[PDB]
């Protein structure tokens, strides 16, 4: 029964928020963002900032379908210094396919950390 199946969603856990927030991301935005990214099932690391950018943060364009789907759905509505961990299905991160250090199927999880909005073009 198809119809008792729910989408893919991810999980959003708000791990760390200011009290202050002058400003909330929105489409378009630019996210300057350190993350880490591991496997759910053994909790292990795949990728981070910290350890494969030299330590330094990237910056994200949100709601372009930029990267991972997961993403665009869990790092809406972020203040300056909030710091968040999303659990993202397959469908939502490497799906089927996988990638390089992600197995096929791998539920993600995600701990980012909002440092500077932008405007966007």
């Given at each position: ?7 893919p969603?991810?999980?959003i856990?708000?791990?760390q ?13 630019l996210?300057?963002?350190?993350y880490?990214g591991?496997?759910?099932k ?23 379908l ?16 909030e ?8 469908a ?30």
């Amino acid at each position: 029964m198809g119809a008792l199946i729910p989408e893919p969603e991810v999980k959003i856990e708000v791990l760390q928020k200011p009290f202050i927030c002058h400003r909330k991301t929105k489409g378009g935005d630019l996210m300057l963002v350190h993350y880490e990214g591991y496997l759910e099932k053994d909790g292990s690391l795949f990728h981070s900032t910290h350890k494969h950018n030299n330590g330094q943060p990237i910056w994200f364009t949100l709601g372009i379908l930029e990267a991972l789907k997961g993403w665009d759905q869990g790092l809406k509505g972020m203040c300056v210094g909030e710091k968040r961990k999303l659990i993202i299905p397959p469908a939502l991160g490497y799906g089927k396919e996988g990638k390089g250090k992600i197995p096929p199927e791998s539920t993600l999880i995600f701990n980012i950390d909002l440092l500077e909005i932008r405007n966007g073009p």
